[PDB]
Symmetry: C2
Subunit: 750 residues, 2 copies
């Protein structure tokens, strides 16, 4: 029972001890030499090192508070429940007859004294000298602490000491409310405040924080059930929150003194953001263990939200703000060392401008997470709350100019001149990078991120495994999101590339399921390919300047993998549209003025991309094989159909067979496939078919073909020389080549 109570009380008391210890270190960093304050802090520390924390306190007002909380009194708790230039000339020397008034100051009540401060603060309020008003707020408070430790308080009878102190504490409350409001809402509060005025100031506030910590002992002992807990609706329970809302104000007021205290000391605090954050992490730990952060309209919680967004290079600010956003709006990031602790705060609804401040830090955390993990995490659920709160941006006329240039470029015919300009990166769109606060999502690429999430929804739901369509609306959501991101950003070649990716998946959905669209709606399929190809051009053009930019290759190394995939997906698109059922169908100029590409020049273009995709992805066995397909189709092209320049640049039998030996060399460089995985016979099968056609054409002798045909790893009589002199003996060995390949074709799918 008692050991269980000590086990429950121990980590929160450890948090309090570390909070007061780091507070003490922050005091001693600034030359605060008030040993009374240090002794009060050490009294708090040894009290929190004890089970009976209230016994070790020896300040008289704190044990008066202990008697007030122990012996509840209804009315005592209900107590807590014209030229200004002339006046400031009167009171400022006060705060020969001046020495008599100073003697009159010592003979007077403290309640009379604060009215002199309040009249002085009114005169500063009349001339709007808020800094002097903030100063005399602080000068008023430290007098009430001195008489709290005064011997007149010690000589007071305890029946008088109940009500007289209770008036002073209630008067202490409303000064803090005004001063914190002057601290939070006005930056000029700390101009005339010197160090020793400040060193007198927060030491009183820390003592007040020490004083309120004595009141904090009753609640947590009342939380467990050793103490009688007040009923709901009782004025005692209402009195506790009336105390605790000041404590929320107190440390935040202490934080404003700490923030000025952290500043002006660069030799003392080389990491000034973190030490400010360390206090704020500790206090919200202290309040959040005690369920105290939600009170007083979350003014501390709203304050800490602003400060974390200012700080950038903190280690684990995301741990701190994640606890805040779980408290404020229930935005579970799911990252960081500490899980989000239950603080009993309702999730307040996410306002749009409130969501838009968080974009610059959300996208930083989301950029390091894998897309598959981004499907599983709660990080996307924050984005779902954010984007619904943010919504669609306003219709800018500058965006509408950039929008309408996209529609005519996407319906533009395929210019062969611009293909060579894509090699130079000279293809530019009629667009301008606009400068608006609505583009600050696009300046961080937030609309790019929305496209990647919905694409991974499309990529995650496997189309081969799709027995039910209709979940392609997210692709249309992403395509609108990609069009939104591309309007602000011309240079985002990846946004062009994902746009180029999305057009094929719409085309794949049309042609895989129904063959009727190949007979009735060919024009929109022509439109989709031409939409894809022109998307790839700027995805080639803007990536070429990106590849020419060396610092752009440094960040996000997977985009270089996306760069080489774009090189693969370029020539994949070129070879696909040049054959059936299309056969250069987007390349027509029936409604078009300009030249068209030939199929030969398309196949001349695509292999060099596959040559470039071979360099970046050497384990990609397709890229040498796709090189070998196009050059053989270039070898399929007759010389008379070629012009004079391209007749010299037609591939030779030496260079065609160079790539045919190259692709199976790369296939042999791969490790062997596992059980249940047959190796790809298509590099092995297609090299035989061209050689058989080369013998059928007669450019390749069957004797010299069989030298090539027995270097294959799946050759009949491999490693043993077989000489061939007749075509029928060649056709017999070709039959032996096919049937031995049919031995490797176990599933009968070649």
């Amino acid at each position: 029972s008692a050991t269980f109570f000590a086990t429950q009380l121990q980590p929160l008391q450890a948090a309090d001890q570390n909070l007061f210890q780091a507070t003490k270190n922050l005091l001693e960093n600034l030359g605060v030499t008030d040993r009374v304050t240090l002794d009060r802090i050490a009294e708090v520390l040894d009290s929190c090192a004890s089970d009976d924390r209230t016994s070790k306190f020896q300040n008289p007002a704190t044990v008066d508070l202990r008697n007030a909380l122990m012996n509840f009194d209804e009315d005592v708790a209900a107590i807590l429940l014209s030229d200004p230039v002339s006046v400031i000339e009167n009171l400022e020397p006060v705060l020969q007859e001046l020495l008599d008034l100073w003697k009159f100051l010592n003979s007077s009540s403290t309640e009379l004294r604060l009215l002199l401060w309040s009249r002085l603060a009114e005169a500063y309020g009349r001339i709007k000298y808020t800094t002097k008003q903030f100063s005399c707020f602080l000068r008023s408070i430290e007098v009430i602490v001195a008489d709290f430790e005064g011997e007149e308080y010690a000589s007071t009878p305890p029946e008088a000491r109940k009500t007289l102190f209770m008036g002073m504490l209630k008067a202490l409350d409303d000064l803090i409310i005004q001063s914190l409001h002057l601290a939070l809402n006005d930056n000029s509060s700390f101009d005339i405040i010197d160090e020793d005025h400040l060193r007198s100031s927060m030491s009183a506030i820390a003592k007040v924080s020490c004083m309120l910590h004595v009141a904090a002992m009753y609640e947590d002992e009342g939380r467990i059930g050793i103490l009688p807990s007040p009923a709901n609706g009782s004025p005692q329970k209402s009195f506790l929150n009336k105390l605790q809302e000041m404590q929320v104000r107190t440390w935040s007021l202490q934080y404003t003194m700490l923030k000025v205290g952290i500043n002006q000391h660069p030799d003392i605090f080389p990491k000034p953001e973190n030490d400010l954050a360390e206090f704020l992490a500790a206090v919200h730990q202290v309040l959040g263990l005690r369920k105290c952060c939600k009170s007083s309209n979350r003014i501390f919680l709203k304050m800490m939200r602003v400060e974390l967004l200012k700080q950038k290079n903190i280690e684990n600010w995301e741990d701190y703000l994640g606890q805040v956003l779980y408290d404020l709006h229930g935005l579970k990031l799911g990252v960081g060392v500490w899980d989000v602790q239950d603080h009993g705060c309702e999730p307040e609804n996410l306002e749009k401008r409130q969501a838009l401040q968080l974009v610059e830090k959300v996208a930083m955390l989301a950029n390091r997470m894998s897309m598959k993990d981004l499907l599983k995490s709660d990080l996307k659920t924050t984005i779902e709350r954010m984007q619904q709160a943010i919504g669609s941006a306003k219709s800018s006329p500058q965006m509408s100019h950039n929008l309408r240039n996209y529609t005519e470029y996407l319906k533009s015919p395929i210019h062969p001149l611009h293909m060579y300009q894509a090699l130079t990166g000279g293809v530019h769109l009629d667009a301008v990078s606009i400068n608006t606060p609505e583009s600050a999502p696009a300046k961080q690429g937030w609309f790019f991120l929305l496209g990647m999430i919905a694409l991974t929804k499309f990529k995650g739901v496997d189309l081969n495994r799709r027995q039910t369509p209709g979940a392609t609306d997210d692709l249309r959501i992403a395509a609108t999101f990609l069009r939104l991101q591309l309007q602000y950003t011309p240079d985002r070649w990846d946004a062009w590339f994902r746009l180029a990716e999305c057009f094929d998946y719409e085309l794949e959905e049309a042609v895989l399921w129904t063959a009727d669209k190949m007979n009735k709606e060919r024009a929109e399929l022509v439109k989709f390919q031409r939409h894809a190809i022109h998307s790839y051009i700027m995805a080639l053009s803007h990536s070429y300047a990106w590849a020419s930019n060396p610092a752009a290759l440094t960040s996000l190394e997977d985009d270089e993998e996306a760069l080489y995939d774009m090189y693969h997906e370029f020539g994949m698109r070129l070879y696909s549209s040049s054959r059936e059922p299309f056969a250069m169908e987007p390349f027509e100029h029936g409604d078009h003025v300009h030249n068209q590409m030939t199929d030969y020049q398309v196949w001349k273009f695509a292999a060099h991309l596959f040559r470039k995709a071979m360099v970046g992805k050497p384990k990609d066995w397709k890229n040498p094989y796709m090189v070998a397909k196009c050059l053989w189709k270039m070898y399929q092209k007759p010389t008379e159909e070629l012009d004079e320049k391209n007749r010299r640049h037609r591939p030779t039998v030496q260079m065609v067979l160079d790539a045919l030996e190259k692709t199976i060399e790369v296939v042999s460089a791969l490790p062997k496939p596992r059980h249940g995985q047959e190796p790809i016979l298509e590099p092995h099968y297609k090299i035989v078919s061209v050689i058989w056609k080369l013998v059928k054409r007669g450019d390749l002798s069957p004797q010299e073909a069989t030298k090539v045909l027995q270097r294959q790893p799946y050759s009949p009589d491999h490693g043993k020389e077989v000489s061939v002199e007749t075509a029928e003996d060649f056709k017999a060995y070709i039959i032996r080549c096919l049937r031995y390949l049919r031995d490797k074709d176990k599933s009968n799918w070649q």
Copy 2:
């Protein structure tokens, strides 16, 4: 005739040549390689290289303008003079010539799309210009600022192309004359909105690429090529080659409309060239220089043709703003001065060029215009001295600008800071702050106010203002200022430096010039009238009290300034001025601790705080003089006042010294070298010119000092002769004199005093001459010495030769090193020595003659009533010393009845009329005592005068009888009957 016309044309043609040359070079440097534009500019060069500029032009539009202006037609000018009325979007107008959806149709135009292009090659020019107006309207309707601006640029290139177009070249000229002005009305209205968007929103230069810039800005130069001949046409009437158009004519209104069009289009050229120079800084390494030279070429051409104020001064309101942002040009001040002369008349008188008239009237400069004019003037103000400020026209511009700015309104910080200056000024003097001032550790409670109204004071604008006002106060010397009344600039500068110090308390220089204003205010009260020293002592203490507080805060903020090297070079005269602060702190401190002031600002009689000693303040001042001596190595006064400091410290006796400063007492030798240190610097001075008195002020001072301490016993008289012969004014210099007695020390010092009086040819060194009397006759000697009457006579022979007249008038003239209020005191210090001098000599005759001079010069004597006590009582002694008057201790008139006393008192008066009573000493001493009561006029108590009268009357009564108010009354009638017989005897002798 023609040679004269070419001579007048030659600066105009040179300016046009340099303008088009710079335009050609900058167009070439932007890559505009169109040969036709270069050929047009070269044709303008051919025009400007010859007298017949008009014949060399061969472009059809230029010669069409030339033909239009050679024979002017009113109906030709009617469409340009009247405003443009736009035909609407009508099918009938389309037949005659033949917002987003409007953008989506028309911007494709700018096979059915190709059908429009063939038609637009054959349609009207303005029909295309209608669409460019319509597209800019749609761009205006969507409020695209850059796209609406871009349509304006393309529309310019249309109508320039038609002037090279063959449709206009093949038009019949009667139709073309309407067509030339009709396009020109369409031309000029486009430049109205083109300039307006180019000087309001800078977003209009967004979508312009390189070639768009190279297309648009080249056509503007063609307009600048074409419009040049119109100003050339006006120049023919300017020299009288052609007749001028009459005022109020259509010819006059046609011409100035072309003037306000030509300047307006030229301002558009500056906007494209500014954006075009940027983005290519390799081509333009100094973009401030080329933009200034481009504006210099434009404004000089328009200025000679008086086009600056044209088109509502829109070029001038652009040029001044862009010159303000640039700071590191050389001779921008040349470019600034002519521009502000064209707008306000603020002639600066600096740079290479003086102002030349551009035919423009000034406008009164407003407050916000002056705030932009703060910074460039303030740098230009610091280049000149205050004397050069007092001769420049820049001073006249500043007084307008302060009239333009006005007095600033007080902030709550300003009410806080200026009050704390007064409370510090009302504070008593503490030695802690002066010890802190040597550390520089004194600060004031005054926050640095951060407002744009302090950006004047951040340049020291208010600091400049008092420096002008103090220069005018210092411009007339106060020796030559015989007319007080030109003294309000002292109070004007006194108001100004507080306003500087409110925003900038840390400026040590603003505290220092504030102190001299309080210092000079102390002079003018006491220089003419000693009555303020007589009656108004409560205010004269306050001036030096507030001076000393201001002198502290000058020193404290100087300590950071004098010890850091960064301020040690900036405005090197202020480094020289910092050593002048040390010299006038010590001359202020040493002044207020002696007569007439006598330590008055030091006390705390209103209050708590310890007051300083004079020994504490003499050592404090001597700290300043040596610190003055390093930065003033040739200034002899800084060793001179440090020599006077230790002598006051040495003459201060050791008993009243504190035991800390008892160890800090300098030796007898420690003042001898410092006097010789001054006489070293005086010997190190350059030799004085003819008519200049040499500085023997060290020389008799060390003579007087060595006279004292030898007679005080600090040195033997033999050892003094070596120290005396080191000095440059030693008589028989280099010849050794051995002195064994004090009388031998008396004679040689008298020979030194005679030698210095040989150098007193102007007869001014009365301190030497009163010490020549002092060495001859010491005050503290025994009165019964037999030579003391003789030594006072030889002392009087020195004084009456030099300063004292035969009617006993001394001439205490104010020395240049003498302090204000000191010579009033120094006169009566010479009086009390002279009164005791004539006491030993028993000179009763010259005392009464001197007494009339004291009575006449009563207002000139400090503490004159107290001086009249000592002089009368010594003369009462001198009346008793000369005449041996017994003191009537016993009243002999008690035996007389008042009836019998009237009998004897009339018998005494009848005895006094006898000539035997003239030899009576008691009657004669009563006669001067009667005149002494008349000369008193109850300035003192008259009862002491009546004591000498009644004792003289009783001594008379002790003589006539063998032969209190009634006693004096019968004594009054005794002198009255005596003087009646004296006038009766003198009257009968003359008859």
